[PDB]
Amino acid sequence: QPGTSNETPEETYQRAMKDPEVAAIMQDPVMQSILQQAQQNPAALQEHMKNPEVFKKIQTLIAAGIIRTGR
């Protein structure tokens, strides 16, 4: 049921798509590189979050529910 949606990641993407900050960041290849590095080492993404430019980028998609960073 769309009303009780929650297991539909696709819905989250659309919402984030409406946010101008999300569109701009998703179009940036920097985030793709961070994810890959994280696979090679967990500390890779950590230093990225600390970085001011990447910090804003990473956080934007998280709040938008586009990326899961929980554990």
Domain ranges of the chain: 1-71
* Cα angle value 29/30/35 (rounded, 5°): 100
The CA distance from 35 to 39, in Å, is 7
Residue in the structure block whose two tokens are 């709040």: 63
Experimental method of this PDB entry: NMR
Cβ proximity of 57 and 25 under 8 Å: yes
Kindly indicate whether the domain formed by 1-71 is annotated with CATH number 1.10.260.100.
yes
Q: How many CA atoms lie within 13 A of 69 on its CB side?
A: 17
